Unconditional design. Structure first.
Lengths: 332, 332
């Protein structure tokens, strides 16, 4: 027989099968949890493809009796315990480049939607607001601000963060970034200003946008304490991970006006609902259903790449043949 | 007594009066038409301040018995018959620089809102759509496209058009422009590609954005004929003037899918209403209530400048003391 590969949290495998036809039997589970995965896959699955809707703990990982490779169809892999996965002898890889510029463009659109209130002006138009006089335009568009001279604070100057910084400079933004893992001099190469502490970033930025990965040290990076270190009436953008922000702390900040507005493509609990969660009655809120990454070309691009990574793992040597394995440190 | 200056289509004159206190008696009419302007102003008004909500024809102009200067608090002056105004000996000026980058930023936000469907994804979230699976994200975000490699066609490479072009290049856009009034070589200075005809612009652009002024030769520039010259599934953005687009021709294009989406901050008839007009049932439509220009700094900036232009006209020599008079050609 052929090695079994399973799409854990999905149903469509059309893009991947031309690549995996002669190398593995491909099945799907469409499961939000390992509860919903039939034991046939748990016992025989050699490879696994998954997105961001199912999380795998050590307990989940130990239920797979033959799994050897997990390929995350996407850039983020915070939903996988790569540390223990490596312990159990399971390599974990991702697809980091497919949606970089897509995410940066959706970030800039969210930033612009806060400064220009375009989305809010649109919603007010569908709700029947009549804007006839100049005074009424200033009123319903109240809060719209000039961008040139504003300081954009970038938290995490990675691949998406850099694309965000380059675009932000074209609008007159003065871009700052805080990245405690980058080597010395990265700011000189890109003509940006850097800060040492997260408090310095928040203290100087008129609008803060998150572009870091969710790791064991930055959970609730934006919390009730760090939120008090932001400028009065600042902006918050988050297309990275919902686990980075304490929504209850953010909710109160929006209600009291300490944060003038927030744009969020990710949330602590997804799918996101305006009726449930700490943001139920939070004002000045724009939210997208975790779609900052999605383009037709990016969706196909990352699915074909992940399929090839799976192929390399089955016909090559782990983890040397892999291209984007992220847990070679912990892989026994 | 002092020379009378009147804010025709407005009520607030706080910003302007510190500048005009010792030079003119300032009053307001809050009138949508010359019908609503009391004859006291029609007879004695020497200067006039107006926005874009009241239009002045030759008939309207001839009702002013002492008017000598009209200052449009804004960049556009298509709502004034400057030709006949000059005939009647009435100089007309504008404020062209206050909201250039504001308008370009709102343009880019509208462009990004079409490519990224951010505004539409937000509205769908408030309406209760549950986006839990990857397949559902591709579905509700259907239509979102990659920007790099896309060709943005700019119609009118003026002050706002240039700011739009510079920003568009930072996103990977390949920017084209059509401006039959610019001198030879303007494309070389800014590193852009130029086209001779409006049909060439529409034939090559994936997304067309209007940045021209409404003049006697470009009314309904986007009409049923020129609309058929655009690419299949193209984008339309308009933060210039609603009179440039034939909304009935655009309405059918959106319904048939010939245009995938349209973002409009101006309309043929304002204030805009989703229940009235040729766009009543037009799909894939984003609209803002003519607010692409507005910032707090731009609003104050253009009102103080216009007040100073009025001052220069009253204490100086017309039209030599004026800074931004646009009808010196026709001014007798
Ligand atoms: N807690 C944190 N604060 C700021 N930056 C971070 C943090 N954790 C990770 N990063 C950075 O975020 C960037 C992510 O890049 P990428 O993986 O290409 O999206 C890397 O440069 C990391 O060093
Ligand atoms: N019908 C038209 N088609 C294309 N460009 C135009 C048209 N009419 C005017 N323009 C240009 O639009 C620009 C407006 O610049 P500004 O007045 O600075 O916004 C000028 O460069 C004009 O030459
Ligand atoms: Ca501010
Ligand atoms: Ca297209
Ligand atoms: Cl402002
Ligand atoms: Cl796809
Ligand atoms: Cl695409
Ligand atoms: Cl104001």
């Amino acid at each position: 027989h052929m090695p079994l590969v399973a799409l854990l949290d999905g149903r469509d495998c059309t893009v991947e099968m031309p690549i995996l036809k002669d190398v593995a039997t491909v099945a799907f589970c469409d499961a939000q949890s390992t509860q919903e995965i039939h034991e046939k896959v748990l016992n025989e699955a050699v490879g696994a493809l998954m997105y961001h809707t199912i999380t795998l703990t050590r307990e989940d990982l130990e239920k797979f009796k033959a799994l050897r490779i997990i390929v995350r169809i996407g850039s983020g892999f915070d939903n996988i315990d790569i540390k223990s996965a490596g312990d159990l002898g399971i390599a974990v890889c991702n697809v980091p480049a497919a949606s970089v510029e897509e995410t940066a463009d959706s970030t800039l659109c969210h930033i612009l939607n806060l400064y220009r209130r375009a989305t809010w002006l649109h919603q007010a138009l569908r709700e029947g607001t009549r804007v006839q006089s100049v005074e009424q335009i200033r009123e319903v568009a109240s809060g719209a601000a000039r961008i040139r001279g504003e300081t954009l604070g970038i938290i995490g100057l990675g691949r998406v963060g850099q694309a965000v910084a380059l675009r932000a400079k074209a609008f007159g933004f003065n871009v700052l970034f805080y990245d405690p893992y980058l080597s010395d001099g990265v700011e000189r190469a890109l003509g940006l200003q850097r800060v040492s502490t997260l408090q310095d970033l928040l203290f100087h930025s008129d609008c803060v946008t998150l572009h870091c990965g969710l790791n064991e040290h930055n959970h609730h990076l934006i919390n009730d304490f760090t939120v008090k270190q932001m400028r009065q009436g600042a902006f918050l953008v988050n297309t990275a991970r919902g686990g980075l922000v304490d929504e209850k702390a953010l909710a109160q900040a929006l209600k009291e006006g300490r944060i003038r507005g927030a744009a969020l493509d990710v949330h602590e609990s997804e799918p996101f609902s305006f009726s449930q969660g700490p943001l139920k009655d939070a004002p000045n809120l724009i939210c997208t259903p975790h779609a900052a990454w999605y383009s037709e070309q990016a969706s196909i691009e990352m699915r074909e790449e992940a399929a090839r990574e799976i192929r390399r793992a089955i016909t090559g040597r782990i983890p040397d043949s892999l291209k984007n394995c992220v847990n070679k440190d912990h892989l026994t």
